C-alpha cells in the first residue's frame, strides 16, 4: 500500500541522516569511540539497537565539533527510528559480542536501511 | 606467501564475477575459490562451480542469482590447492559492488518547440539507481553533464532548433539501496534535429 | 473559510487564516503543539489582505532541522473572546506533506554571449532529507512582453543553472526561478526569486 511507501520514505530520511554523519566524519578521538553493534539487523524491530546507541552517538559528535548540529540531528533520528521500529516488545534486538568504531557502526545501519528500502521497491 | 587480490562485481543483480590475476605466482597455478556468507543459513562453505580462465589458468569465479545475497556479508577465500595453509580471505559488501547495465530505450519528446524531455529505461528496480546525463550540440567542443535521481527523466528547457543535439546516460546503484561507486557503461546515444 | 500553512523544510512554518464572514477584531494566534517534541510555539496573527491573517512560527535558527517526516503538529487558531481563548480552527499538520521552500537566491550571470546566457542560482534553507528530489521552473522577461506572457521553462531535476538559447543581441532581459521538492501531497512552488537583470552582448 502507501503505508509501505510511507515506511520507505522514513527509511530514506533515516539513511540520509546517517549518510550525512558519515560524510561529515570523512572530512581522531572520534575514531576510538566504540559502539554496540546488532547481532542481526534484517527487520524494523532491530532498530532498537540503533535507538539505544543514540546517546553515545550524540556524545561523540558533540566532542568532535570545531558542520553538524547534533542535538537536532539525534533527536530527528530518534523520532524516525521510534516510528519505524514498531511497538516495543521484549527481545527486540540482540547485540554482537564485540563493539566497533563509529564508521563500522554507521555503515552497518546504512546497510540495514538500504536492505529494507530495496525490498519495498 | 601473499595471494592475489580478489575483486567481485555484481552485474545488474543477475550474476557476480569475481576475478583475480595470478601471474604474480612463481609458476602457473590453478587457485581455487570458496565462499560463504556471515551470520546466516549460508554458513556452509561453497566451492566455485563455474571457474573463469585466463591463459588456461583459473582467474575468476561466476556466481548465479540464487547464490547472491546483496545485504549479507560475503566472504571469499582464495587457496593454493597444492598448499592448504596458504590462503587469503576477504569480506565484501556486495551492495557497494553492483554495476547496472546501461540504460536503454532513450526517447525524446517535446514539451514545447524549444523544450525537450529525455526518458529512458533500466532493467532494474528504478528506485535503486541514480543517473548521469550528458548532452552536446554540433556547436559544442565537449559534453555538458548533469546528475539525475531515480526519477530518470531529464529536461532541457531551452533548445535551439538550428542545432543538432546528442544525448547519453549512465547509471549507478547509489544511494538508497547501496553505495556503489562505479557507473554503468554509457547508453547508446540518441540524436535530435 | 480556510486555514493554510506551509513548512520551509527547516525551522519556519508560515500560516494564513482567511475568514468568510464576520471579521475578528480581537487578538488571534496560531498555536503549534507537536505530538513528539518538548516545545510548543505561537505567533500573533496580523492582517495581510482584505480578509486574511498571517504569521510565522520560527522553531529555531534559519538552517536548523526542527521537524521530520514523522512529526505531526496540531496547529490551532486561538482568538480572544473576553478573557478566554477560543479555538477557531484546527489541523493535524504533517510538515513534509505541506512544503513550500524559500525562493532560490544568489542568482548570477555565469557567462553571457550575443544569443546565449548561462545563469546559476542556489537554494536556501533546504533540508538534506530531499537529497536531489527537487525540480525548478524558470522564466525570462523580454522587451515586448510581461511576466505573465513569459513561458515557464521546466527543469525536472536538481539543476541549478540554465543556458538560455536563441536570444537577441544587445537586448535587456530579466530572469526568475522557483523551486519545489517532489515530496508531499500539498507541497507547492516556492515564490519566484528576485529577478536578475542582464544584457546580451552586442556582436
Ligand atoms: C519565515 O517564512 C516567512 C514566510 O515566507 C513564506 O512562507 C515560507 C514557508 C516559505 O515558503 C517562503 O518562501 C514564503 O515566502 C517569511 O516571511 C516573509 O518574508 C518576505 C521577505 O522578507 C516578506 O515579503 C513577506 O511579507 C513575509 N511573509 C510573512 C507572512 O511574514 C520569513 O522571513 C521567514 N523567516 C525565516 C527566518 O525563514
Ligand atoms: C502544549 O500545548 C498543549 C495543549 O495546549 C492547550 O491545553 C489547554 C488545557 C490550555 O492550557 C491551552 O491554553 C493550551 O494551549 C498542552 O497540553 C495540556 O497540558 C496539561 C498537562 O500539563 C493537560 O492538563 C492538558 O490536558 C493538555 N491539553 C490537551 C489538549 O491535551 C501541553 O502541556 C503544552 N506543552 C508545552 C511544552 O507547553
Ligand atoms: C553553467 O554554469 C555552471 C558554472 O558555475 C556550470 O555548472 C557547473 O559545471 C561544473 C563543470 O563544468 C561543475 O563542476 C559544477 O558543479 C557545476 N555547477 C552547478 C551548480 O551545477 C554549467 O555546466 C554551465 N552550463 C553550461 C551549459 O555550460
Ligand atoms: C588448470 O585447469 C585446467 C582445467 O580445469 C581444471 O581441470 C578440471 C578437470 C579440474 O581439475 C578443475 O578443478 C580444474 O580447474 C587444466 O586444463 C590445466 O592444465 C590446469 N593447469 C594447471 C597449471 O594446473
Ligand atoms: C563475467 O563472466 C562471464 C563468464 O566468463 C561473461 O559471460 C561476462 O561477459 C563476464 N564479464 C562481465 C563484465 O560481465
Ligand atoms: C526496451 O524496449 C523493448 C522493445 O520495445 C522492450 O522489450 C524492453 O523491455 C525495453 N527495455 C527496458 C529495460 O525496459
Ligand atoms: C506550483 O505552480 C503552479 C502555480 O502556482 C500550481 O500548479 C501549483 O501551486 C504548483 O505547486
Curated annotation (Swiss-Prot), chain B:
Where is the major localization of this protein? membrane
Any domain commentary? The WSXWS motif appears to be necessary for proper protein folding and thereby efficient intracellular transport and cell-surface receptor binding. The box 1 motif is required for JAK interaction and/or activation.
Q: What residue intervals hold the motif WSXWS motif?
A: 183-187
Instruction: Give the domain of life.
Output: Eukaryota
What are this entry's molecular-function GO terms? coreceptor activity; cytokine binding; cytokine receptor activity; interleukin-15 receptor activity; interleukin-2 binding
On subunit structure and binding partners, the annotation says: The gamma subunit is common to the IL2, IL4, IL7, IL15, IL21 and probably also the IL13 receptors. Interacts with SHB upon interleukin stimulation. Interacts with IL9. (Microbial infection) Interacts with HTLV-1 accessory protein p12I.
**How does the record classify its membrane topology?**
Single-pass type I membrane protein
Reported effect, residue 178 to R: In XSCID; uncertain significance
Its annotated compartments are:
Cell membrane; Cell surface
Q: State what protein this is by name.
A: Cytokine receptor common subunit gamma
What are the Fibronectin type-III domain coordinates in residue numbering? Answer: 102-193
For this record, an example GO cellular component is: endosome
Q: Which GO terms describe its biological process?
A: CD4-positive, CD25-positive, alpha-beta regulatory T cell differentiation; cellular homeostasis; cytokine-mediated signaling pathway; gene expression; immune response; interleukin-15-mediated signaling pathway; interleukin-2-mediated signaling pathway; interleukin-4-mediated signaling pathway
Q: What keywords were assigned to this record? A: Cell membrane, Disease variant, Disulfide bond, Glycoprotein, Host-virus interaction, Membrane, Phosphoprotein, Receptor, SCID, Signal, Transmembrane, Transmembrane helix
Q: What family classification does the UniProt entry report for this protein?
A: Belongs to the type I cytokine receptor family. Type 5 subfamily.
Q: Which disease is it linked to?
A: Severe combined immunodeficiency X-linked T-cell-negative/B-cell-positive/NK-cell-negative: A form of severe combined immunodeficiency (SCID), a genetically and clinically heterogeneous group of rare congenital disorders characterized by impairment of both humoral and cell-mediated immunity, leukopenia, and low or absent antibody levels. Patients present in infancy recurrent, persistent infections by opportunistic organisms. The common characteristic of all types of SCID is absence of T-cell-mediated cellular immunity due to a defect in T-cell development. X-linked combined immunodeficiency: Less severe form of X-linked immunodeficiency with a less severe degree of deficiency in cellular and humoral immunity than that seen in XSCID.
Swiss-Prot record, chain C:
Q: Where is this motif: WSXWS motif?
A: 189-193
Report disulfide bridges, numbered on this chain. Answer: 5-15, 28-79, 43-55
Compartment annotation: Cell membrane
Which parts of the chain does the record assign to the membrane side Extracellular? 1-203
Q: Which family does it belong to?
A: Belongs to the type I cytokine receptor family. Type 4 subfamily.
* Entry function: Receptor for interleukin-2. This beta subunit is involved in receptor mediated endocytosis and transduces the mitogenic signals of IL2. Probably in association with IL15RA, involved in the stimulation of neutrophil phagocytosis by IL15.
Q: What is known of its domains?
A: The WSXWS motif appears to be necessary for proper protein folding and thereby efficient intracellular transport and cell-surface receptor binding. The box 1 motif is required for JAK interaction and/or activation.
Q: Which disorder is recorded? A: Immunodeficiency 63 with lymphoproliferation and autoimmunity: An autosomal recessive disorder characterized by immune dysregulation resulting in lymphoid proliferation, dermatitis, enteropathy, autoantibodies, hypergammaglobulinemia, and immunodeficiency with recurrent infections. Patients show increased susceptibility to viral infections, particularly cytomegalovirus disease.
What is the recorded name of this protein? Answer: Interleukin-2 receptor subunit beta
Source organism of the structure: Homo sapiens
Which lineage do the record's taxonomy fields give for this organism?
A: Eukaryota, Metazoa, Chordata, Craniata, Vertebrata
* Gene behind this protein: IL2RB
Amino acid at each position: 500500500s502507501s503505508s509501505t511507501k510511507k515506511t520507505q520514505l522514513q527509511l530514506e530520511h533515516l539513511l540520509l541522516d546517517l549518510q550525512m554523519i558519515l560524510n561529515g566524519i570523512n572530512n581522531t578521538r572520534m575514531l576510538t569511540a566504540k559502539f554496540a553493534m546488532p547481532k542481526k539487523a534484517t527487520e524494523l524491530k532491530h532498530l532498537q539497537c540503533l535507538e539505544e546507541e543514540l546517546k553515545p552517538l550524540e556524545e561523540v559528535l558533540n566532542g568532535a565539533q570545531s558542520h553538524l548540529r547534533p542535538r537536532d540531528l539525534i533527536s530527528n533520528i530518534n523520532v524516525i527510528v521510534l516510528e519505524l521500529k514498531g511497538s516495543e516488545t521484549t527481545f527486540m534486538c540482540e547485540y554482537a559480542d564485540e563493539t566497533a568504531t563509529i564508521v563500522e557502526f554507521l555503515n552497518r545501519w546504512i546497510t540495514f536501511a538500504q536492505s529494507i528500502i530495496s525490498t519495498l521497491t | 606467501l601473499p595471494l592475489p587480490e580478489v575483486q567481485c562485481f555484481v552485474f545488474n543483480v543477475e550474476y557476480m564475477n569475481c576475478t583475480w590475476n595470478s601471474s604474480s605466482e612463481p609458476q602457473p597455478t590453478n587457485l581455487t575459490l570458496h565462499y560463504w556468507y556471515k551470520n546466516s543459513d549460508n554458513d556452509k562453505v561453497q566451492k566455485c562451480s563455474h571457474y573463469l580462465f585466463s591463459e588456461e589458468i583459473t582467474s575468476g569465479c561466476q556466481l548465479q542469482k540464487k547464490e547472491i545475497h546483496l545485504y549479507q556479508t560475503f566472504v571469499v577465500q582464495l587457496q593454493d590447492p597444492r598448499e592448504p595453509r596458504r590462503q587469503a580471505t576477504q569480506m565484501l559488501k556486495l551492495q557497494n559492488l553492483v554495476i547496472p547495465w546501461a540504460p536503454e530505450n532513450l526517447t525524446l519528446h517535446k514539451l514545447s518547440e524549444s523544450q525537450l524531455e529525455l526518458n529512458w529505461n533500466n532493467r532494474f528496480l528504478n528506485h535503486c539507481l541514480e543517473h548521469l546525463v550528458q548532452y552536446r550540440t554540433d556547436w559544442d567542443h565537449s559534453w555538458t553533464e548533469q546528475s539525475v535521481d531515480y526519477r530518470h527523466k531529464f529536461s532541457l528547457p531551452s533548445v535551439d532548433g538550428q542545432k543538432r543535439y546528442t544525448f547519453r546516460v549512465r547509471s549507478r546503484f547509489n544511494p538508497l539501496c547501496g553505495s556503489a561507486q562505479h557507473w554503468s557503461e554509457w547508453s547508446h546515444p540518441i540524436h535530435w534535429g | 473559510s480556510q486555514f493554510t500553512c506551509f513548512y520551509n523544510s527547516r525551522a519556519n512554518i508560515s500560516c494564513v487564516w482567511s475568514q468568510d464572514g464576520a471579521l475578528q477584531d480581537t487578538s488571534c494566534q496560531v498555536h503549534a503543539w507537536p505530538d513528539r517534541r518538548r516545545w510548543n510555539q505561537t505567533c500573533e496573527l496580523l492582517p495581510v489582505s482584505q480578509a486574511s491573517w498571517a504569521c510565522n512560527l520560527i522553531l529555531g535558527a534559519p538552517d536548523s532541522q526542527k521537524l521530520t517526516t514523522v512529526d505531526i503538529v496540531t496547529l490551532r487558531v486561538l482568538c480572544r473572546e473576553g478573557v478566554r481563548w477560543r479555538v477557531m480552527a484546527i489541523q493535524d499538520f504533517k510538515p513534509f506533506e505541506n512544503l513550500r521552500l524559500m525562493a532560490p537566491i544568489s542568482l548570477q550571470v555565469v557567462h553571457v554571449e550575443t544569443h546565449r546566457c548561462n545563469i546559476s542560482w542556489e537554494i536556501s534553507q533546504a533540508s538534506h532529507y530531499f537529497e536531489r528530489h527537487l525540480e525548478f521552473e524558470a522564466r525570462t522577461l523580454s522587451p515586448g512582453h510581461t511576466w505573465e506572457e513569459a513561458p515557464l521553462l521546466t527543469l525536472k531535476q536538481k539543476q541549478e543553472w540554465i543556458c538560455l538559447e536563441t536570444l537577441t543581441p544587445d537586448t535587456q532581459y530579466e530572469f526568475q526561478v522557483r523551486v519545489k521538492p517532489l515530496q508531499g501531497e500539498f507541497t507547492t512552488w516556492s515564490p519566484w526569486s528576485q529577478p536578475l537583470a542582464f544584457r546580451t552582448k552586442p556582436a
